[PDB]
Amino acid sequence: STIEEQAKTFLDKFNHEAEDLFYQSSLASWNYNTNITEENVQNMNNAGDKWSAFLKEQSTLAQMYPLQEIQNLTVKLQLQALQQNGSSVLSEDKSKRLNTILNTMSTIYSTGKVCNPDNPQECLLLEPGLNEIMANSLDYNERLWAWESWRSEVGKQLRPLYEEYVVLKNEMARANHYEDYGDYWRGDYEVNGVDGYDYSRGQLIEDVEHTFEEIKPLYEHLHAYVRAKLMNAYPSYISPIGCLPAHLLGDMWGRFWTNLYSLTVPFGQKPNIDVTDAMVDQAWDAQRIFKEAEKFFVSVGLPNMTQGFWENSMLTDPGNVQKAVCHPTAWDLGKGDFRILMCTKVTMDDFLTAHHEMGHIQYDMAYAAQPFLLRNGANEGFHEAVGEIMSLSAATPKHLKSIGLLSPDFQEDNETEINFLLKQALTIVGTLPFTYMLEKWRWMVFKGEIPKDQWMKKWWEMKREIVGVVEPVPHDETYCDPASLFHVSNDYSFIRYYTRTLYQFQFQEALCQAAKHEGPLHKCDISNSTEAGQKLFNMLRLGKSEPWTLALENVVGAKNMNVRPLLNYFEPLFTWLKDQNKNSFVGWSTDWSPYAD
Amino acid sequence: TNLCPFGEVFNATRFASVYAWNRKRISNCVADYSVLYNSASFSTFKCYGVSPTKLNDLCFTNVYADSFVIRGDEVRQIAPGQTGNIADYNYKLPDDFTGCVIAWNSNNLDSKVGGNYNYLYRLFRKSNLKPFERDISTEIYQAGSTPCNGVKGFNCYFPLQSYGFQPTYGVGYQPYRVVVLSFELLHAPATVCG
Ligand SMILES: *[C@@H]1O[C@H](CO)[C@@H](O)[C@H](O)[C@H]1NC(C)=O
Ligand SMILES: *[C@@H]1O[C@H](CO)[C@@H](O)[C@H](O)[C@H]1NC(C)=O
Ligand SMILES: *[C@@H]1O[C@H](CO)[C@@H](O)[C@H](O)[C@H]1NC(C)=O
Ligand SMILES: *[C@@H]1O[C@H](CO)[C@@H](O)[C@H](O)[C@H]1NC(C)=O
Ligand SMILES: *[C@@H]1O[C@H](CO)[C@@H](O)[C@H](O)[C@H]1NC(C)=O
Ligand SMILES: [Zn+2]
């Protein structure tokens, strides 16, 4: 006779309806990905529209149950995700305007290409074209040409569309009673209904700012080392006390520094660890790779693959007859269906990527017992992070010597430790300043603290100060640099990549300390230890049904996000970098630019 | 001098939905449980209050063969002293149940591409079901105090829901055809033995 009964009765009706319609759209998307035809596009569109109207229709009845009279927490957590009506609150006239602009900028990013003034008839796209030039070319002009031509051509189109993109998303938040649209993305970490675990939307800003301060000592030396290596290869084009040029960072936006490992490698005469030539002589295929990966999760106690997994998954390029996207993705279709779509080749990277894509499956099978609305990551940062901690143990020398890839007589010494960490240091640590900068930039724009004319001025002030990167050519108000990036134009919140970095090493130090590991952290392997696997399994099955601050307390014994595992992981490297940087200037000033002479 | 016709109970092409579950009386015949126990085609085969070896030589006067189709993970809810949707709202065995439980994998047949919407279940009901009670009523469930008048709407739900079956589900969900056998004794003579 209460609202609680009407709430449980409604959601129970909603659960078995969400199971059936979501599996239709997910299976249709599977058909589109594996088999690309004009006929398969309409099958995904019709299935994707029914699910879009279903959550839109159920949101009408959901707002009829007030959360004020609901005592039970689990029902309140489910409706809170369902009751939000999203973009439907906006007027119907601007409704068509928003989705069109979302699709307009998306096509500009996909169809965007660069064209040289020399032969206008020939042009090159970003992928593969610019990503091959930015990574593989050591030339100063060639890298600079690819850097400017992409932001100059594409930036002119997206900026006038991006300004209207800001206006529409702002009124949607105020209709949802949020201070700005940036508060909407920070609302995913919001916690209410549990005494003492409440994590406010504004607490995220103060925390992320505090966490990045302790990373600066590690990063200022890591940036000082990369600047020292590229200086010797480019004496005239790089100042010793100045910030790094943008196009020399290894890729277009400076997101991943992995491409710079070639020139920045600590020791050239020491052999790098490579499992590639070991897999060729053994002639492994996509079949045995996951068997070695599935055997890993058996050692930690986690459940194994379903019989329908190996039958329904496409593990290789389906020939030249039908084209398929080879971007690795872990597809959870619901109702006990778990699939991994990958084009598998024999490489060191694919074997390390294999454990990542399999990590999501072990993660989704844990909370699969929860109802659909509770089927999700505990937060937006755990779902991706769980796959990375598994790849960490897979790249360690101990796990590779156990499965037979690396020779048992392989020699290990001081020069080996630094080599493997600096490769991980460029990817893991190098992406933090870029990620914090991007999120702080969107948050001040949506809030309104930045006038529209100061965007390009405020952007490169954060480039120089936070990340220590300067523009090779000045940009006026016409260009929009961030819009050219994938996640900016595709309307994906990018903070996920900052949190998964901090949450992976917390799990890493927690699970290894539970395995009674001895010595350095980077040599840890969780294989054969059930103590860690069972401890981790406690959180994985919770889903979003519990506050992430509460679920995090189980694994790491700490309620707050902390970077202490991150510095402890690179502590062997952090000591070595300062020894090579004692003769070099640490730090950078924001008043230097390459175009000011 | 006749064998009990288990052939039409197990190998029937199409069974009833779990709320529609079909009862078939079996009497005046001789039942051979050995081929059933020795076939090894049955995923879950259990008995309660009787041993599968002992019932080979034994005589029960009434044998009821119940037939329905449920979810793979919902098989555990068929047993004495169990709760849940299938137990409370669909098919309910009493705590004293003396019979056996039989299940096997139907996924090679009952499931087809696109889902099969014939199989249904009752998701909501006003109260729990008494032992062995078939309720076929299609009457609209009433959650609230708002009169339904037999139309869909707010807090008025159509209780019968469908299980979509594609071949591609994981082993857990897959459809199973469950046959529940009941055994009782009354004043009637027992014509069913080994
Ligand atoms: C892919 O779709 C086309 C279009 O109907 C069809 O002819 C072809 O058989 C499909 N291939 C596979 C492997 O399903
Ligand atoms: C809330 O309801 C669910 C089932 O609807 C139940 O499992 C849970 O225990 C309830 N919460 C509390 C605090 O009892
Ligand atoms: C997973 O482990 C169980 C444990 O008994 C085993 O029966 C099953 O065959 C395993 N899965 C596969 C695909 O072999
Ligand atoms: C786990 O134990 C097995 C059994 O002795 C062993 O072969 C394997 O190498 C162990 N794992 C690691 C990573 O050493
Ligand atoms: C059903 O058919 C199979 C094979 O056709 C047979 O082995 C089985 O005994 C039959 N069922 C019964 C109850 O005899
Ligand atoms: Zn991932």
Residue numbers in the entry:
A (entry chain A): 19 to 615
B (entry chain E): 333 to 526
Paper text:
It forms homotrimers protruding from the virus surface and, once engaged with the host-cell receptor–human ACE2, undergoes a substantial structural rearrangement to fuse the viral membrane with the host-cell membrane. The S protein is also the primary target of the humoral immune response during infection.
In particular, the Beta S protein contains the D614G substitution and additional nine mutations, including a cluster of mutations in the N-terminal domain (NTD), three substitutions (K417N, E484K, and N501Y) in the receptor-binding domain (RBD), and one substitution (A701V) near the furin cleavage site. We also examined the conformational space of the Beta S trimer in a complex with human ACE2. We further focus-refined the stably associated RBD-1-ACE2 region to 3.9-Å resolution. For the Beta variant, the original salt bridge formed between RBM K417 and ACE2 D30 was abolished due to the replacement of the positively charged K417 by a small uncharged Asn (N). Still, the N501Y mutation could compensate for this loss by generating a new hydrogen bond between Y501 and K353 on ACE2. The N501Y substitution could also form more aromatic interactions with neighboring residues including Y505 from RBD and the Y41 of ACE2, in line with other reports. This could contribute to the higher ACE2-binding affinity of the Beta S trimer relative to those of the WT and G614 S. The Beta S trimer structures from this study show that the E484K mutation changes the 2H2 binding footprint (epitope) property from acidic to basic.
